[PDB]
């Protein structure tokens, strides 16, 4: 063990949609799945970044080979004045924060690979394939395909129409069986399934997470390096309506990040209201929240303790001289 | 000699339009002009190809450094099934026919350079600049810019929007001061003058020939290798209306190809109608044609003799075993 059925469950739990189940099962009967996930390197990640990271951890725990693609070429093109280093210092900050996050979750990293787009997206073979793609991709499909995902400008750039085919070719050049992302990427993924065969390449399996509401919703966001006192204050302002299970950023963070750690979640609650309870199925926590026997305040306190456990080793790592230095440069 | 004024006259005679006269004169006060001209390598050239070749000959005679860019990458992308070799055999046919044409005109070739697009259009620096261009070129300007020139399809390809910026970057990567082409390329040329500075590169001088009506007008066309008997028959079917000087493919071929050889043209005419006459100014031939004292038949006979003089060494070169072989392969 784990068996092919167990691997399939770990790979696909919590996803909104799977494209390519037939090929996914054929691969898992024989060998480990190869998957990539792309990240931008521009913003400053906050605790929402744990939602894709929780699936990356699942893939690693299932035995998959996981490549994380850092989009540095794209980052430079959306801010060409944005000085050289600063872009690659931010790539380096993202690489170090992802490693720390996965170490905190607690998964084996031997099969995790980090690649930068510029490592190969300017190579002659890849560029020739981009030209081939431009000679079969209609201008329509590229906008259609990119109908969301591409930031929407008034005088839109050519760059926008190139994005979908570059993402498709990354599947082939990273030599993976599958790409993971969000359901908001669905039209990019179906574009890749249509047009890779035109170039003689295989369509890939596509794994799509839901768009998970933010924890604070339901700067102002909890940064991965925020200290305990600010985690505490920001979570106490989090929206969390009593009995609301359908649209609740606190429950969503438990479903997608905290419950999966050990397939359980501890609610901290005063003895007066029943004392602590350990849930072994998310649906059971949902039922009690909908019944209003788990109060929002207690839900938030329960998330605060578990989240601070996840953040503690990351904050400690980033307070060493070498990473404290990097964080300041990447984000003056 | 020749002086800067003489070079300017040879470079710009017969053009429809010059963009960049100020920079052109500044360069010719100091050094030789560097110019490129691009050619496709797909069709089978016919005698109309002498119209751009006559300007290439002028540039060489003026002392310019001339680069001819063979668009082989573009040729492959518009026919990817179109087998490898066959595309490059056609590049080789075009290289050999241009050399023979210029040798027949009689110009020095020391400063003529042949480059294939694939020699550099897949290089990392060039590709990065293509991505930079895509991040400043609006999708509008590229279609606007490409409003003619790009073959017009119903479900148009992305490839079409890339063409104008690739042509612009060729100016920089070929390290020229100027690009020559047809007036039908004007919107591509003004695109290059707008967007090269965005990348930190200089705008170029642009030299534009008119769109010259075909000789036969005014397969069915005279191929550069057609034998004398077929030249004769095809020219006798050429349209050439008596007294018509404004739209006359026979007069246009004389203006753009034959008169420039020695800045004269001999009309062959029977003694009954005045005998032969040597014109030293095209306007003088135009006046006599408009006066109907040069008959269409005599105009055509005069072109037949001069054209067969131009074609004779080309036909002889292409009848050697090595070039006869190449012609058949390039065009089964």
XYZ file of C-alpha atoms in Angstrom:
664
model
C 0.000 0.000 0.000
C -1.110 2.505 -0.740
C -3.145 0.937 -3.461
C -4.182 2.591 -6.742
C -7.636 3.318 -5.184
C -6.013 4.942 -2.144
C -3.724 7.032 -4.358
C -6.714 8.110 -6.463
C -8.578 9.167 -3.350
C -5.679 11.216 -1.996
C -5.031 12.840 -5.432
C -8.642 13.751 -6.036
C -10.128 14.468 -2.583
C -11.553 17.999 -2.217
C -11.232 18.791 -5.960
C -14.172 20.396 -7.722
C -13.556 18.520 -10.988
C -11.393 15.889 -12.595
C -10.882 15.736 -16.405
C -9.258 12.513 -17.632
C -10.332 9.900 -15.060
C -9.845 7.078 -17.565
C -6.157 7.888 -18.168
C -5.604 8.731 -14.490
C -6.748 5.196 -13.457
C -4.699 3.572 -16.253
C -1.542 5.321 -14.979
C -2.126 4.510 -11.298
C -2.461 0.747 -12.149
C 1.207 0.846 -13.266
C 3.298 3.748 -11.960
C 3.398 7.092 -10.176
C 1.529 10.069 -11.594
C 3.586 13.052 -12.812
C 1.825 16.382 -12.121
C 2.652 20.053 -12.398
C 1.250 23.148 -10.817
C 2.116 26.723 -11.913
C 2.422 29.709 -9.613
C 2.921 33.370 -10.282
C 5.719 34.996 -8.284
C 4.439 38.549 -7.951
C 2.215 39.076 -4.885
C 3.025 38.236 -1.216
C 1.402 34.953 -0.250
C -1.118 34.855 2.521
C -2.812 31.915 4.237
C -5.048 31.186 1.238
C -1.916 29.793 -0.410
C -2.346 26.784 1.884
C -5.353 25.703 -0.270
C -3.306 24.711 -3.372
C -0.425 23.662 -1.059
C -2.686 21.151 0.667
C -3.283 19.413 -2.684
C 0.442 19.535 -3.516
C 0.973 17.805 -0.140
C -1.649 15.168 -1.044
C 0.041 14.497 -4.360
C 3.419 14.043 -2.645
C 1.941 11.766 0.004
C 0.370 9.648 -2.775
C 3.829 9.123 -4.319
C 3.426 11.484 -7.257
C 6.233 13.279 -8.936
C 5.310 16.982 -8.533
C 6.791 19.860 -10.485
C 6.102 23.450 -9.374
C 6.565 25.894 -12.221
C 7.520 29.457 -11.102
C 6.249 31.849 -13.846
C 9.211 34.219 -13.855
C 9.105 35.005 -17.566
C 5.462 36.002 -17.226
C 6.283 38.086 -14.136
C 8.970 40.047 -16.042
C 6.721 40.671 -19.030
C 3.942 42.135 -16.816
C 6.457 44.520 -15.274
C 9.497 44.994 -17.518
C 10.613 48.006 -15.590
C 10.251 45.910 -12.460
C 13.982 45.510 -11.887
C 15.751 42.242 -12.635
C 16.775 40.859 -9.215
C 13.605 41.897 -7.401
C 11.671 39.544 -9.708
C 14.048 36.660 -9.031
C 14.304 37.556 -5.326
C 10.519 37.085 -5.262
C 10.888 33.745 -7.079
C 13.414 32.808 -4.363
C 10.957 33.955 -1.592
C 8.181 31.811 -3.126
C 10.519 28.770 -3.423
C 11.554 29.116 0.214
C 8.015 29.705 1.524
C 6.626 26.654 -0.435
C 9.366 24.448 0.955
C 8.646 25.686 4.492
C 4.889 25.214 4.056
C 5.253 21.625 2.845
C 7.746 20.863 5.640
C 5.216 22.229 8.137
C 2.392 20.107 6.662
C 4.853 17.221 6.917
C 5.309 15.475 3.565
C 8.258 13.907 1.812
C 9.937 16.190 -0.698
C 12.158 13.789 -2.632
C 9.850 13.879 -5.647
C 9.205 17.646 -5.558
C 10.921 19.585 -8.363
C 11.076 23.406 -8.717
C 11.475 24.795 -12.271
C 11.491 28.426 -13.470
C 9.757 29.220 -16.752
C 12.894 30.968 -18.062
C 14.771 27.647 -17.665
C 13.120 26.443 -20.902
C 10.408 28.874 -22.247
C 13.055 30.649 -24.396
C 14.600 27.419 -25.756
C 14.571 26.868 -29.512
C 12.360 23.705 -29.426
C 9.826 25.295 -27.170
C 9.757 28.501 -29.256
C 9.264 26.511 -32.493
C 6.332 24.777 -30.866
C 4.909 28.178 -29.846
C 5.078 29.197 -33.561
C 3.437 25.922 -34.554
C 0.668 26.580 -32.074
C 0.181 30.102 -33.422
C -0.387 28.560 -36.903
C -3.263 26.369 -35.691
C -4.703 28.391 -32.751
C -7.474 30.718 -33.914
C -7.495 34.172 -32.317
C -11.036 33.407 -31.093
C -10.141 30.236 -29.147
C -7.344 32.013 -27.497
C -9.586 34.787 -26.206
C -12.362 32.314 -25.489
C -9.905 30.073 -23.799
C -8.581 32.979 -21.919
C -12.031 34.488 -21.168
C -11.079 34.729 -17.479
C -7.561 34.316 -15.991
C -6.102 37.039 -18.204
C -6.302 40.422 -16.493
C -8.752 42.473 -18.540
C -7.429 45.703 -20.083
C -9.115 48.307 -22.272
C -6.404 48.187 -24.952
C -5.537 44.553 -24.556
C -2.076 43.234 -25.444
C -0.944 40.464 -27.733
C 0.665 38.859 -24.662
C -2.841 37.879 -23.472
C -3.505 35.704 -26.502
C -0.201 33.864 -26.072
C -0.764 32.797 -22.437
C -3.088 29.798 -23.051
C -0.821 28.105 -25.585
C 2.317 28.688 -23.441
C 0.522 27.026 -20.487
C -0.472 24.106 -22.771
C 3.080 23.609 -23.983
C 4.346 23.619 -20.397
C 2.494 20.291 -19.928
C 4.552 18.691 -22.655
C 7.889 20.314 -21.859
C 7.629 19.473 -18.124
C 6.888 15.873 -19.247
C 3.902 15.428 -16.943
C 0.713 13.379 -17.126
C -1.455 15.993 -15.427
C -1.803 19.649 -14.458
C -3.421 20.872 -11.237
C -4.989 24.301 -10.818
C -8.221 26.045 -10.006
C -11.633 25.623 -11.616
C -11.141 29.204 -12.900
C -8.485 27.674 -15.225
C -10.979 25.208 -16.799
C -11.086 26.942 -20.237
C -7.242 27.013 -20.328
C -7.196 23.305 -19.509
C -9.765 22.323 -22.145
C -7.812 24.476 -24.650
C -4.713 22.365 -23.844
C -6.690 19.133 -24.286
C -7.840 20.330 -27.771
C -4.620 21.783 -29.131
C -1.730 19.616 -27.798
C -2.830 16.789 -30.153
C -2.552 19.205 -33.090
C 1.195 19.329 -32.348
C 1.349 15.563 -31.965
C 1.376 15.701 -28.146
C -0.908 13.921 -25.722
C -3.780 15.593 -23.917
C -3.212 15.642 -20.111
C -5.334 14.878 -17.084
C -6.616 18.077 -15.416
C -7.276 18.386 -11.667
C -9.268 21.435 -10.575
C -9.708 22.771 -7.023
C -12.769 24.882 -6.212
C -12.464 28.634 -5.766
C -12.333 28.632 -1.998
C -13.556 31.754 -0.176
C -10.947 33.621 1.818
C -10.474 33.065 5.545
C -10.627 36.779 6.289
C -13.571 37.616 4.169
C -16.325 34.893 4.290
C -2.940 43.571 4.084
C -6.161 42.863 5.951
C -5.105 39.330 4.984
C -3.067 37.039 7.220
C 0.433 36.944 5.774
C 2.317 33.660 6.114
C 4.841 35.443 8.353
C 2.343 37.420 10.513
C 3.055 37.086 14.243
C 0.609 35.312 16.589
C -0.893 38.542 17.849
C -1.850 39.667 14.353
C -3.195 36.219 13.390
C -5.357 36.487 16.446
C -6.609 39.953 15.698
C -7.277 39.301 12.021
C -9.191 36.127 12.695
C -11.395 37.793 15.251
C -12.629 40.185 12.545
C -13.321 37.221 10.193
C -16.902 36.903 8.981
C -18.480 33.722 10.221
C -22.277 33.689 10.431
C -23.860 31.286 12.916
C -25.393 28.229 11.210
C -24.012 29.281 7.727
C -22.361 26.223 6.127
C -22.659 27.092 2.441
C -20.572 30.196 2.291
C -18.171 30.306 5.219
C -14.440 31.050 4.773
C -13.608 29.608 8.234
C -15.290 26.274 7.460
C -13.699 26.290 3.990
C -10.212 26.683 5.469
C -10.940 23.766 7.808
C -12.259 21.631 4.908
C -9.385 22.331 2.505
C -6.385 22.866 4.802
C -6.760 21.788 8.404
C -9.026 18.725 8.400
C -6.879 16.997 5.709
C -3.698 17.066 7.905
C -4.844 13.973 9.860
C -8.404 13.630 8.601
C -9.725 15.111 11.824
C -10.397 18.514 13.439
C -10.579 19.419 17.101
C -13.158 21.996 18.167
C -12.236 23.852 21.365
C -15.455 24.527 23.298
C -16.232 25.219 26.968
C -17.508 22.410 29.128
C -20.786 24.361 29.537
C -21.578 23.739 25.823
C -20.294 20.169 25.626
C -16.523 20.481 25.898
C -14.012 19.755 23.116
C -15.032 17.473 20.280
C -12.824 15.713 17.727
C -14.482 15.324 14.294
C -13.409 12.481 12.041
C -15.544 13.501 9.058
C -15.977 17.086 7.758
C -19.686 16.423 7.174
C -20.102 15.866 10.958
C -18.575 19.288 11.755
C -20.786 20.850 9.080
C -23.885 19.250 10.669
C -23.012 20.611 14.152
C -22.238 24.080 12.793
C -25.563 24.171 10.891
C -27.256 23.066 14.205
C -25.568 26.010 15.997
C -23.887 23.796 18.599
C -20.475 24.975 17.351
C -20.338 28.740 17.838
C -18.481 30.995 15.377
C -16.164 32.201 18.151
C -15.234 28.648 19.025
C -14.761 27.718 15.360
C -12.386 30.699 14.982
C -10.499 29.883 18.158
C -10.103 26.284 16.946
C -8.741 27.535 13.594
C -6.419 30.013 15.377
C -4.733 27.270 17.375
C -4.324 24.936 14.377
C -3.228 27.711 11.991
C -0.614 29.014 14.483
C 0.727 25.409 14.683
C 1.142 25.448 10.870
C 2.708 28.919 10.790
C 5.090 28.468 13.767
C 7.909 26.590 11.954
C 7.582 28.872 8.927
C 7.968 32.026 11.075
C 10.956 30.449 12.849
C 12.648 29.529 9.564
C 12.124 33.033 8.160
C 13.610 34.618 11.180
C 17.073 33.273 10.395
C 19.433 36.017 9.101
C 19.528 34.660 5.533
C 15.709 34.405 5.050
C 14.882 37.544 7.070
C 17.158 39.364 4.628
C 15.475 37.844 1.563
C 11.986 38.706 2.767
C 12.854 42.384 3.151
C 14.440 42.683 -0.254
C 11.656 40.817 -2.038
C 9.164 43.170 -0.401
C 10.775 46.458 0.590
C 32.414 59.655 -56.572
C 29.755 58.681 -56.378
C 28.767 61.476 -54.094
C 26.121 61.317 -51.346
C 23.633 63.004 -53.765
C 24.377 60.418 -56.462
C 23.977 57.560 -53.975
C 20.672 59.039 -52.781
C 19.428 59.244 -56.344
C 20.346 55.645 -57.146
C 18.840 54.369 -53.834
C 15.589 56.245 -54.223
C 14.921 56.402 -57.989
C 11.614 54.792 -59.039
C 10.379 54.372 -55.429
C 6.830 55.401 -54.606
C 7.740 56.657 -51.119
C 10.634 57.235 -48.780
C 10.160 57.374 -44.965
C 13.182 58.710 -43.065
C 14.863 61.077 -45.549
C 16.518 63.029 -42.734
C 18.348 59.978 -41.332
C 19.049 58.626 -44.829
C 20.936 61.859 -45.754
C 22.772 61.906 -42.395
C 24.053 58.355 -43.027
C 25.107 58.976 -46.640
C 27.246 62.006 -45.528
C 29.423 59.534 -43.564
C 29.191 55.877 -44.601
C 27.405 53.217 -46.629
C 23.737 52.489 -46.013
C 22.809 49.047 -44.632
C 19.488 47.781 -46.058
C 17.474 44.591 -45.953
C 14.778 43.161 -48.128
C 12.657 40.095 -47.214
C 11.383 37.502 -49.654
C 9.055 34.584 -49.249
C 10.351 31.295 -50.654
C 7.120 29.574 -51.640
C 5.981 30.412 -55.193
C 8.009 30.101 -58.452
C 9.379 33.486 -59.455
C 8.392 35.008 -62.733
C 9.662 38.121 -64.511
C 7.894 40.474 -62.092
C 10.595 39.500 -59.599
C 12.921 41.738 -61.618
C 11.071 44.792 -60.167
C 12.398 44.413 -56.577
C 15.659 42.969 -58.000
C 16.247 46.159 -59.969
C 16.210 48.155 -56.710
C 18.480 45.598 -55.009
C 20.854 46.148 -57.965
C 20.639 49.938 -57.472
C 21.449 49.594 -53.793
C 24.498 47.438 -54.578
C 25.690 49.831 -57.269
C 25.383 52.712 -54.762
C 27.740 50.875 -52.376
C 25.129 49.738 -49.873
C 25.417 46.686 -47.746
C 22.347 44.605 -48.728
C 20.915 41.706 -46.768
C 18.255 39.477 -48.365
C 16.204 37.677 -45.748
C 14.693 34.340 -46.947
C 11.512 33.756 -44.847
C 11.920 30.017 -44.350
C 10.403 29.891 -40.874
C 7.302 31.632 -42.191
C 7.193 29.258 -45.178
C 7.230 26.191 -42.878
C 4.528 27.578 -40.607
C 2.159 28.204 -43.566
C 2.628 24.607 -44.676
C 3.844 22.406 -41.816
C 3.018 19.276 -43.701
C 4.969 20.727 -46.601
C 7.945 18.404 -46.203
C 11.215 19.625 -44.726
C 13.699 19.583 -47.638
C 11.255 20.825 -50.265
C 10.976 24.077 -48.278
C 14.748 24.464 -48.064
C 15.215 23.275 -51.665
C 12.954 26.200 -52.604
C 15.051 28.539 -50.431
C 18.090 27.216 -52.341
C 16.295 27.797 -55.727
C 15.483 31.397 -54.713
C 19.097 32.021 -53.554
C 20.459 30.702 -56.844
C 17.947 32.570 -59.031
C 18.603 35.918 -57.177
C 22.335 35.497 -57.630
C 21.856 34.745 -61.341
C 19.493 37.702 -61.791
C 21.906 40.163 -60.177
C 24.822 38.729 -62.190
C 22.759 39.229 -65.352
C 21.913 42.840 -64.408
C 25.641 43.213 -63.766
C 26.332 44.494 -60.249
C 29.002 43.780 -57.682
C 27.979 41.231 -55.077
C 30.675 41.635 -52.432
C 28.292 43.450 -50.095
C 25.292 41.163 -50.713
C 24.457 38.866 -47.779
C 21.861 36.037 -47.779
C 20.316 35.113 -44.391
C 17.547 32.600 -43.591
C 15.011 33.539 -40.927
C 15.648 30.259 -39.070
C 19.308 31.332 -38.666
C 18.209 33.653 -35.827
C 14.353 33.889 -35.433
C 14.431 31.007 -32.889
C 17.371 32.416 -30.880
C 16.811 33.206 -27.209
C 17.480 36.994 -27.519
C 15.202 37.358 -30.471
C 12.450 35.298 -28.793
C 12.684 37.394 -25.594
C 12.256 40.492 -27.708
C 9.199 38.910 -29.376
C 7.710 38.427 -25.853
C 8.583 42.014 -24.971
C 6.837 43.189 -28.104
C 3.762 41.114 -27.273
C 3.578 42.960 -23.900
C 3.400 46.392 -25.554
C 1.744 45.627 -28.943
C -2.036 45.960 -28.728
C -4.025 43.322 -30.616
C -5.634 46.178 -32.586
C -2.373 47.661 -33.931
C -1.267 44.300 -35.015
C -4.391 43.704 -37.083
C -4.428 47.319 -38.207
C -0.793 47.088 -39.015
C -1.415 43.896 -40.793
C -4.634 45.095 -42.510
C -3.244 43.903 -45.860
C -0.183 41.645 -46.396
C -1.587 38.899 -44.175
C -3.622 36.424 -46.209
C -7.209 36.825 -45.036
C -8.890 33.739 -43.546
C -12.365 33.231 -42.103
C -11.076 31.727 -38.844
C -7.895 33.717 -38.654
C -4.833 32.387 -36.821
C -2.717 33.839 -34.062
C 0.236 33.591 -36.472
C -1.209 36.582 -38.379
C -0.915 38.907 -35.403
C 2.718 37.931 -34.829
C 3.950 38.726 -38.367
C 4.259 42.543 -38.044
C 6.356 42.465 -34.879
C 8.634 39.682 -36.238
C 9.261 41.818 -39.361
C 10.020 44.833 -37.112
C 12.503 42.880 -35.026
C 14.242 41.650 -38.177
C 15.364 45.274 -38.752
C 17.207 45.291 -35.460
C 18.581 41.754 -35.574
C 19.890 42.170 -39.157
C 21.572 45.387 -37.897
C 20.390 47.525 -40.805
C 19.559 51.206 -41.204
C 16.695 50.636 -43.632
C 14.189 48.138 -45.014
C 13.027 48.044 -48.637
C 9.705 46.600 -49.764
C 6.490 47.474 -51.510
C 4.043 50.275 -50.748
C 1.615 47.480 -49.744
C 3.918 46.996 -46.702
C 3.510 50.641 -45.547
C 1.410 49.803 -42.429
C 3.978 47.129 -41.409
C 6.749 49.693 -41.821
C 5.014 52.422 -39.808
C 4.269 49.780 -37.128
C 8.039 49.101 -36.940
C 8.787 52.832 -36.676
C 6.326 53.101 -33.714
C 7.211 49.982 -31.759
C 11.004 49.435 -32.124
C 11.610 52.462 -29.841
C 9.429 50.819 -27.179
C 12.098 48.090 -26.993
C 14.876 50.665 -26.951
C 15.733 50.168 -30.642
C 15.975 52.777 -33.361
C 13.299 53.358 -35.970
C 14.585 52.556 -39.507
C 14.390 54.261 -42.870
C 11.727 52.664 -45.109
C 11.978 52.522 -48.917
C 8.790 51.576 -50.760
C 8.439 50.561 -54.426
C 5.091 51.052 -56.165
C 2.839 48.091 -56.893
C 3.850 47.628 -60.495
C 1.318 46.031 -62.862
C 2.318 42.699 -64.333
C 3.933 42.407 -67.757
C 1.467 39.757 -68.881
C -1.646 41.379 -67.637
C -1.642 45.219 -68.157
C 1.554 29.808 -65.550
C 0.283 32.340 -68.068
C 3.192 34.263 -66.526
C 6.706 34.300 -67.959
C 8.821 32.115 -65.699
C 12.447 33.162 -65.242
C 13.505 29.924 -66.962
C 10.964 29.993 -69.851
C 12.592 29.377 -73.243
C 12.701 32.101 -75.927
C 9.765 30.672 -77.829
C 7.484 30.862 -74.803
C 8.686 34.367 -73.860
C 7.764 35.352 -77.363
C 4.349 33.781 -77.291
C 3.439 35.073 -73.842
C 4.463 38.610 -74.645
C 2.433 38.662 -77.814
C -0.713 38.048 -75.742
C 0.267 40.895 -73.349
C -2.270 43.697 -73.022
C -0.871 46.952 -74.288
C -3.405 49.556 -75.415
C -2.239 52.128 -77.960
C -1.615 55.554 -76.386
C -2.237 54.194 -72.793
C 0.600 55.429 -70.543
C -1.100 55.372 -67.146
C -1.830 51.717 -66.800
C 0.458 49.703 -69.049
C 2.402 46.654 -67.782
C 4.806 46.782 -70.774
C 5.745 50.418 -70.108
C 5.979 49.661 -66.373
C 8.465 46.843 -66.987
C 10.534 49.216 -69.133
C 10.383 51.947 -66.445
C 11.289 49.712 -63.495
C 13.544 47.044 -65.031
C 14.904 47.722 -68.490
C 15.445 51.485 -68.736
C 17.445 51.529 -65.445
C 20.118 49.083 -66.792
C 21.927 51.907 -68.651
C 19.410 54.717 -68.273
C 18.276 54.234 -71.852
C 15.879 52.076 -73.911
C 16.028 51.185 -77.577
C 12.753 50.984 -79.491
C 12.896 48.696 -82.534
C 10.696 50.222 -85.252
C 10.584 49.891 -89.051
C 12.159 52.578 -91.168
C 8.673 53.374 -92.557
C 7.648 54.734 -89.105
C 10.926 56.451 -88.247
C 13.368 53.616 -87.620
C 14.910 52.697 -84.251
C 15.080 55.324 -81.539
C 17.178 55.336 -78.362
C 15.467 57.092 -75.417
C 17.601 58.633 -72.700
C 14.708 59.655 -70.444
C 11.638 57.492 -69.651
C 9.404 60.569 -69.928
C 10.423 60.881 -73.625
C 9.323 57.285 -74.360
C 6.082 57.937 -72.474
C 5.437 61.057 -74.605
C 5.955 59.131 -77.887
C 3.779 56.231 -76.731
C 0.970 58.631 -75.718
C 1.374 60.260 -79.218
C 0.953 56.801 -80.827
C 4.260 56.990 -82.706
C 5.490 53.926 -80.786
C 3.125 51.065 -81.596
C 2.254 48.410 -78.991
C 3.697 45.678 -81.221
C 6.982 47.520 -81.485
C 7.048 48.230 -77.742
C 6.545 44.489 -77.093
C 9.176 43.471 -79.614
C 11.616 45.918 -77.992
C 10.876 44.414 -74.551
C 11.208 40.859 -75.949
C 14.733 41.486 -77.192
C 15.879 43.189 -73.969
C 14.148 40.671 -71.675
C 15.659 37.693 -73.570
C 19.098 39.358 -73.078
C 18.425 39.423 -69.302
C 17.103 35.853 -69.186
C 19.775 34.252 -71.431
C 22.554 33.857 -68.809
C 20.027 32.734 -66.195
C 18.657 29.980 -68.485
C 22.222 28.896 -69.311
C 23.211 28.727 -65.637
C 20.109 26.695 -64.758
C 20.782 24.234 -67.466
C 23.888 22.912 -65.729
C 23.313 19.442 -64.177
C 23.437 20.711 -60.577
C 20.872 23.558 -61.018
C 18.647 21.659 -63.480
C 18.367 19.028 -60.749
C 17.504 21.582 -58.053
C 14.812 23.229 -60.152
C 12.983 19.941 -60.675
C 13.035 18.978 -57.033
C 11.966 22.408 -55.807
C 9.044 22.254 -58.228
C 8.140 18.678 -59.116
